[model samples]
Target chain A: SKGEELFTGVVPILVELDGDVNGHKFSVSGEGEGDATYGKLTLKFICTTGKLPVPWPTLVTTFLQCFARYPDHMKQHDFFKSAMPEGYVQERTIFFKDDGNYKTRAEVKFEGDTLVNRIELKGIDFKEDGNILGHKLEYNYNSHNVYIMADKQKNGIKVNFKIRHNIEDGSVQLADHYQQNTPIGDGPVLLPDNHYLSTQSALSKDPNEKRDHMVLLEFVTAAGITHGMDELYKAMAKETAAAK
Target chain B: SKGEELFTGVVPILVELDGDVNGHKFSVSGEGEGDATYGKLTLKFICTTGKLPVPWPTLVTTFLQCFARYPDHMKQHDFFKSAMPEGYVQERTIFFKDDGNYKTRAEVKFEGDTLVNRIELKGIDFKEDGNILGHKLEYNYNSHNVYIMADKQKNGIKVNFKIRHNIEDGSVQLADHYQQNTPIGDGPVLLPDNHYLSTQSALSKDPNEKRDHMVLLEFVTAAGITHGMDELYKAMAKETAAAK
Candidate 1:
């Protein structure tokens, strides 16, 4: 109930969504300033829900499946030589949808106590060579609204959440496009052993090509909300829920 | 003839003179990059006569007289208080006339080269403090024309000169202002006699009230001129010049 209240407190600043199968826009608003050396920063989100007509959990599973198959798919995509230095390979992941077009919405949140305030989300386009090209939607959430007071520490700040309705998708498809690979099937669905092992092997063969792979899913039921959390914990939790 | 040519080149740079006795204004002009590096310099003088109005002999005598009397005059001039930490005070045995508010001329000769120049006359006045407020005209000489060739033997750039001028009458009015019993008067001037002491010594008895004094005179002359000739000759004799 506290999480629900906190979610309700999140005000929608902007939203852009297309038909249920194409796009989804969600943003919330909040603001505060406190005694800290850190300058103000604003957080926004412009997540794109691709053309998948399934429940949020199913959509997440399919997206993860696509990530797992990315390496084999990459051979079909355009290939370009790179001069990256040696000893530079690392594990990382990012995902989003683009049909040569995308829709975007922005929500702004202001935290006076920490001087964290801004509007997110401006553009929508991911580079095929692997750069996320999109602005963050703004969100203003009160942590107290999302988490029970009993769970909040004495010095904790709370964030609330809210969602904007269907927004028309507007994103340009990149010419040099590449598919992203999300091998971690831990989000929503637990794949069978054969499929999981096969996806893992495919992604590991060409690790560098995995950067452009992404999963497409919508926001229906939000969970994993926490309280009195530092930025890293909050970010990880948010990713986990999004993974679902 | 050389003096005449030098005057022809030097006269235009002088500042204008009107009422009251105005001092000379020397103007310098040249072209170079705006950095501390050396470049060609051109010097000029603008006045009624490019050359001094008096003979070289008279000019020399007056200059020596002033130079000899400077120590005593300095006591009143507050030279000690105003002395710069470095650089010697150079005395010039050159005198030009204040031609009744008209512009005069002079050329700053260096070997065979002559630069056009002019001089302006700034008017003279006296302050209420009984201090003569004479005109302080400036020489608008261009440093560009004064070239500094190489410094051989590491002795820095050496300068040389020769000047010729027409002769004329030399008379001056000397005014002395100083308090008695000061360490200044005990020098050379006291040798002739304590009789050299003025009867009006009573006018200043504070020993500290002594004032600096000097006489003003007019002149007329013309002649050939040369300076920095030796350096020029040496440079011309060097391998560089010979090779050219």
Candidate 2:
């Protein structure tokens, strides 16, 4: 059962599992076109165990079976199988598997040419979620204990693109990051550098329980990924047809 | 074959071999932890072709080749292959091939586990950079064109995330495109929707026309994707250890 009794915030999961977790407080949320996930999600899981326990994969599958409302969309998925990418995937990230204790392996499989990649995403609404821990996992977009296990049950061309603008603050010069060589060089240079994402956090007292949720402010961003491409294409078409 | 200069930007071609795009005015650029690559560039002969043809695939490949800088990073890629996700891909889009014309494709091939997803994304510097139309086209956190394309070759997990705060002067309410027992129920409802992206642009009269670049307001964004993930994980580990 769905939402029978426990509270993990967005989705309901059985709390009394065979583990050291006394009580858990978790929050996973997201926003997307197919589903209105979230511009950002606030995750402040203060487990009674102090350190959190990674949610087991078995339990995660069960949760999807219950909450993701998958049954409702199965037919459409079947319909989509033909057009979807080879080994294409469809997943609704159930929620995060607290990064502290577990070494969980995220799984992927396919109905056919369409790939169905999945992993426990922190917070994607049910009836509209995909495999993830999720894609917006912490928004910093890098290294977490995310156990990504991609399973290619079929042949497909799965492309995962990560692009950022060469935006400089004017404060930061181009040569600083790119010197001695050009960026478009056959072999683009790599400078020993680090990326950054910052957040402001707070701990609140749960008047009702040991593990309380606090304000996890300042989250990762979701911008210009879709809209930018559309406009670019539109511009190209328009500009090309213009009286050059 | 990469970077063997060819032609095919915004206009239709005669299917004949061509020469350099003289009087050609195009700018391609990008930003990443490293330099990016673009592929076999194609340009057709015609100024009446207006804005210019967009080489959908070629530029994408170049961006990848340049980014992989495989020759230089080959050793590092090999060392990190084990840790890299199965068919894992990382593409820092660099440049754009105005899609105003011939249909083309950006290609990619993985060297072991360190997957290099490629697409020439000049929009980064010129804008329209994002997911969506620009998915393989633009990169915007703001408006139009970014359809974020994240495809992992072979079989893999890919989710192009898009999110924004339901930020209105009012607290979270309807205006939001989600409701209960509703949505994806037939044709999901799409209420009043408007998109936008803006950059203060100007054209300086050709003072000799050699070269002149000024502050092109609103460039691409370098937010958290990888670096943030790495940092977040590190922080969690440290905090958990100290307290426990």
Chain A TM-scores for all candidates read 0.15, 0.24
Segments of candidate 1 deviating more than 4 angstroms:
A1-121, A131-244, B1-135, B142-244
True contacts kept of each: 0.00, 0.00
TM-score for predicted model 2 compared with the true structure: 0.20
Candidate 2, residues B1-244: lDDT per residue as tens digits?
1221111121111111111222233433221111122111121122222333332222322232122212221222211122222222332322222312111223232221112332222232222432222324221112212112112232221212222212123221111111011111222112211211111111111122222211111111111112246788999999999999
- When summed lDDT is taken over every stretch of 10 residues in candidate 1 chain A, the lowest stretch is A78-87
lDDT per residue as tens, model 1, B1-244: 1111122221111112211233532222211011001111111111223333221122111120111111222222211112111111221222233222122222221111111111222223333222122222211110111111222333122222222222222332222111111112111211111112100000001122122211111111111222356897787789686798
Worst 10 residues of 1 chain B by lDDT: B197-206
lDDT of 1 by residue, A147-206 (tens): 111112221111211212111243221222111211111122111111111111001112
Over A119-217, each residue of candidate 2 has an lDDT whose tens digit, in order, gives: 332322222121222122122221111111212332211112221212122221011010011111122112211121121222233467454223222
Best model number under DockQ: 2
Each model's lDDT: 0.20, 0.22
DockQ values for all predictions? 0.00, 0.02
